[PDB]
Amino acid sequence: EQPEPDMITIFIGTWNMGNAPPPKKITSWFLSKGQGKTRDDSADYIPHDIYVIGTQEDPLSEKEWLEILKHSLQEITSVTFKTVAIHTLWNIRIVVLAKPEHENRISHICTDNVKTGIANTLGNKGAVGVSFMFNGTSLGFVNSHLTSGSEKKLRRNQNYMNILRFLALGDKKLSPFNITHRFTHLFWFGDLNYRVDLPTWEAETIIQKIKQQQYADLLSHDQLLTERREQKVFLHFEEEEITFAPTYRFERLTRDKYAYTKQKATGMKYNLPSWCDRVLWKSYPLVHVVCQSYGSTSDIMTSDHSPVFATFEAGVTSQFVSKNGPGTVDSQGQIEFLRCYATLKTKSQTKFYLEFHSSCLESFVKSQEGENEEGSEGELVVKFGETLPKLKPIISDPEYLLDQHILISIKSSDSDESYGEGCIALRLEATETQLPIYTPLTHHGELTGHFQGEIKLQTSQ
Ligand SMILES: CC(C)[C@H](N)C(=O)N1CCOCC1
């Protein structure tokens, strides 16, 4: 037998195809060749472990697109990839392909979609997603096509919050947790449709800057970067530095021209050159994740968007079995919390309790109610002191336990509704030692408070 991997590489692609069939060759996309952070030529024959393809305005049948994708990867790698999942909402599609050696490592495949907007605004924008387990590691993938238009960044932020609330991926037992907490690694990509927010009269200046590869002054006005910096969207997500030209809006059949001027076909809106097409991620604390490419193709010109690629190294763990767990506790293992308190932004006064969720526990654990005090600056402080239960992991082996994570929800005793969710890594500097812990708490992806204190982890070593 193959040894189980402790690392895999994942290819993420996002392309708004502009309702046009692709050209006969799209291999440059899967090879991370073009502009930006590109992949070394020496890696060209080396397959990624998993390929996740997100399309928007995709005119192809699932069958048509699968044939082009599989044939493309076969030509690059000489490997016949297995289809893990395919899911389409209108013209928004996600395909997950993996090397055949991974077929038995992949389980718990989930697909879902969310339609964004109401009446007028419901009919073609939203998201599709896929999750699964790769051995002991949970992976989520979201392909979203958000509201278009330079003057709708707020709508895009709203679309993002509706997708992260309502996309039903991952372990349904994680009931207090949205997709931004359910996965070891979460990749969120698509035509996010955020624009370079400069005056219309500066169109030709923007084009000039693009021809000089001087992106700095454009990225300082990129609505996704500015909204993220003001914590309006994609809180606690990462994005690699952008070093490729804006991927929208091109004249078709060339990349020599940006088509930005207002037309009946655009609803009389300008489309200033923009980084519409993006890849972000969020991984659990102290898990290996390294972006190894982030760029756009130069040679695929059927759409008014260029394809975007990103590749990642992602840490993965094995499906651990001991003499004891799974199927029982390992009395040599324990997780203890000392001097713990939650700080909440809520103006309400109910009692709160904690829930601890982790795949290292047989099931989730509910604490006693904490003691509410007033913070010096208005805040609600919920004190747990030394009252939190002792968590009993299924496996005590430090090779397993130090790789695990504890999700925390703080819940109202009156309503059992979560006011905040966060995550604590057990990748500690020491065992049998009081060490500080910390997580921000979010609800619907917005900051709602903090959890901090100390942890004491006992393993079999
Ligand atoms: C399975 C579905 C998501 C299907 N592929 C689809 O896109 N639609 C049917 C339901 O309503 C929206 C349109």
Curated annotation (Swiss-Prot):
PTM field: Tyrosine phosphorylated by the members of the SRC family after exposure to a diverse array of extracellular stimuli such as cytokines, growth factors, antibodies, chemokines, integrin ligands and hypertonic and oxidative stress. Phosphorylated upon IgG receptor FCGR2B-binding.
Result when mutating V289E: In one patient with acute myeloid leukemya; somatic mutation
Domain of life where this protein originates: Eukaryota
Tissue specificity field: Specifically expressed in immune and hematopoietic cells. Expressed in bone marrow and blood cells. Levels vary considerably within this compartment. Present in at least 74% of immature CD34+ cells, whereas within the more mature population of CD33+ cells, it is present in only 10% of cells. Present in the majority of T-cells, while it is present in a minority of B-cells (at protein level).
Subcellular locations according to the entry: Cytoplasm; Cell membrane; Membrane raft; Cytoplasm, Cytoskeleton
Summary of subunit composition and partner proteins: Interacts with tyrosine phosphorylated form of SHC1. Interacts with tyrosine phosphorylated form of DOK1. Interacts with tyrosine phosphorylated form of DOK3. Interacts with tyrosine phosphorylated form of SLAMF1/CD150. Interacts with PTPN11 in response to IL-3. Interacts with receptor EPOR. Interacts with receptors MS4A2/FCER1B and FCER1G. Interacts with receptors FCGR2B and FCGR3. Interacts with receptor FCGR2A, leading to regulate gene expression during the phagocytic process. Interacts with GRB2. Interacts with PLCG1. Interacts with tyrosine kinases SRC and TEC. Interacts with c-Met/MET.
Family: Belongs to the inositol 1,4,5-trisphosphate 5-phosphatase family.
Function: Phosphatidylinositol (PtdIns) phosphatase that specifically hydrolyzes the 5-phosphate of phosphatidylinositol-3,4,5-trisphosphate (PtdIns(3,4,5)P3) to produce PtdIns(3,4)P2, thereby negatively regulating the PI3K (phosphoinositide 3-kinase) pathways. Able also to hydrolyzes the 5-phosphate of phosphatidylinositol-4,5-bisphosphate (PtdIns(4,5)P3) and inositol 1,3,4,5-tetrakisphosphate. Acts as a negative regulator of B-cell antigen receptor signaling.
UniProt remark on domains: The SH2 domain interacts with tyrosine phosphorylated forms of proteins such as SHC1 or PTPN11/SHP-2. It competes with that of GRB2 for binding to phosphorylated SHC1 to inhibit the Ras pathway. It is also required for tyrosine phosphorylation. The NPXY sequence motif found in many tyrosine-phosphorylated proteins is required for the specific binding of the PID domain.
Protein name: Phosphatidylinositol 3,4,5-trisphosphate 5-phosphatase 1
